[PDB]
User: Which sequence fits this backbone?
RNA sequence: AACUUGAGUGCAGAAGAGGAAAGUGGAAUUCCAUGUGUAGCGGUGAAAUGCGCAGAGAUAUGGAGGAACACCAGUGGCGAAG
């Protein structure tokens, strides 16, 4: 009645940064059902940056997504991390049917000034 | 004192991020407001300060302002250089 959204279609946003991978999964209108951050499975340091943490994060996001009720999601990957391609195969291998890869990484049109390099 | 080649005007054409002033646009960063939602986010080689249970990050819809103009974009162009 509040969180058991029986909906056939959804979308999964994979914030795949360089030292985390947050896999949230939601409906079409963006109201979030659940996430799984890669630091919420006990991975610390550069263990979040491994694709195994993104793989297990897509597994434990898809468990809560399928108990809320989802059968087909689209995917929106965001970020140049390492766990971009492994997380969609972990989402497909956990029972959800991934259809569209609409990659939305935010590119400015020479917008704000970037941070200084190392 | 003549001449027309140098130089300059005319006529017919040509291209250009050349300059100044004003207006409009879209993406992105940040902040604020709201909806969803739970325990982390960010960071490093390693962790900590920092933010977050007053509900942060993530996502969605807006609003605010400021700065710079992805692709085009090229040993391309323009300007005396900057």
Assistant:
């Amino acid at each position: 009645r509040r969180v058991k959204k029986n909906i056939e279609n959804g979308v999964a946003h994979i914030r795949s940064t360089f030292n985390n991978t947050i896999v949230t999964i939601t409906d079409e209108f963006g109201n979030a059902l659940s996430w799984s951050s890669a630091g919420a499975l006990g991975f610390k340091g550069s263990k979040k940056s491994t694709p195994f943490a993104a793989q297990m994060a897509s597994e434990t996001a898809s468990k809560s997504a399928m108990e809320h009720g989802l059968k087909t999601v689209e995917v929106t990957v965001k970020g140049p991390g390492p766990g971009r391609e492994s997380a969609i195969r972990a989402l497909q291998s956990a029972g959800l049917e991934v259809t569209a890869i609409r990659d939305v990484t935010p590119v400015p049109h020479n917008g704000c000034r970037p941070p200084k390099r190392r």
About this structure: Residues 1-118 of chain A form one domain. Chain A has two helices and five strands.
